[PDB]
Symmetry: C3
Subunit: 167 residues, 3 copies
């Protein structure tokens, strides 16, 4: 049998894992919230300085938080309402400072003014993320996904958007 | 270095926080379930006796669980199917008896009979809640949100609602 | 006071409950992922050997993982895009090896080819599950639900599904 000190040490480490998992869920919650509400400075804080991830089906690859936030902002203008809704996460602590997470995303885009007015886009994806921990704080390091489906369509003009945090 | 007793005491407190967080998520799960299934008496149990929150753009303010439940019920009759779907929470334990939580809501309303038959309403919101703990039980104390968007529209009559817990 | 050894033993048990809850959430995450992505062999691993659950309004009852997976597969062919999206769980550890969970499901079916092309089905449900633990691993034992609503409808042909993991 193990000593008390040994059992406490075990509890310390096991609890740290549970704490790290909550922190990662909280991280990803912030990420979506800041993205869909276009608080770009805040969003930048969720990203590792060592970040490397890609977009436009691998056509574009970015190497810092600045670079990524700048880019997302370009694809998410005022005219575009975004909802990126995360579900049923599967988080795994790979080491004391690294982790992997799967997420299930429903997404929804609605254009209100500008050149793509009334265009609607809906879909789903299985994201897989990598995270890393730096000075006691978790950060997103890599994000990749598999598309479940994507549908593009013209919305009915007779639909009235009665409230909008962006207009 | 800390003593064993001190390290245990730390674990006791740190684990209590993790327990409180789960309890709050469970609370909010019950809240949505009871709201969307119109079990009003059950819903009343999720609310602090000391509750204070507001509605109709701050025009209406309620001061007890009775008062609030009564009100929600008035805005959620049999004729109205509601789905209030919670995502990616960010919970913070502010003290041993208080907490703050952010939630990401997609919402969906469908009217089946009555004066607004075939009306559909969809939206999203970033809720921010305050919770408090009373005799070992968590309760909702304040709820507020920012609307992402709200769309009102007429549904196609050729859609058949084949099942409905309320009719 | 309780002794140190007693306080440690308490922490061991209380933390195990929190660990079990995370495992159950992860389990259900896998279940949805494998179902919607039609990885049937993987899905079979989420199910207790002692599983017993029913379908077609109680008309059909299955007694093993093989039997169930076989069945779901029959109702979920390539032609049918499925999204079963889980929300706001309420998990309760009933014993060291059994548990109960409530889940809030939004669901969405879209048929792309075959005899039901362009048919769309949307709905919601309050699932209630039973889980059991076998050789350190959690498994789904029973699944049942209450339908919130179900809507069937013909989709507009002018909608382009631009991406699809199944085609
Ligand atoms: Zn959702």
């Amino acid at each position: 049998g193990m000593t008390l000190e040994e059992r406490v040490e075990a509890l310390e480490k096991e609890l740290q894992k549970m704490k790290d998992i909550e922190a990662i869920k909280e991280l990803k919650g912030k990420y979506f919230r800041c993205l869909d509400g276009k608080m770009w400075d805040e969003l930048e804080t969720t990203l590792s300085p060592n970040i490397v991830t890609s977009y436009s089906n691998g056509k574009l690859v970015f190497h810092s938080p600045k670079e990524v936030t700048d880019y997302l902002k370009s694809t998410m203008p005022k005219e575009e309402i975004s909802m990126h809704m995360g579900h049923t996460p599967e988080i795994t602590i790979d080491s004391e400072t690294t982790a992997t997470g799967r997420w299930y995303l429903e997404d929804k885009l609605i254009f209100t003014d500008g050149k793509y007015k009334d265009v609607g886009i809906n879909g789903g994806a299985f994201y897989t993320d990598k995270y890393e921990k730096i000075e006691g704080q978790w950060y997103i390091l890599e994000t990749g996904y598999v598309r479940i489906y994507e549908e593009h369509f013209m919305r009915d003009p007779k639909i009235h958007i009665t409230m909008n945090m962006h207009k």
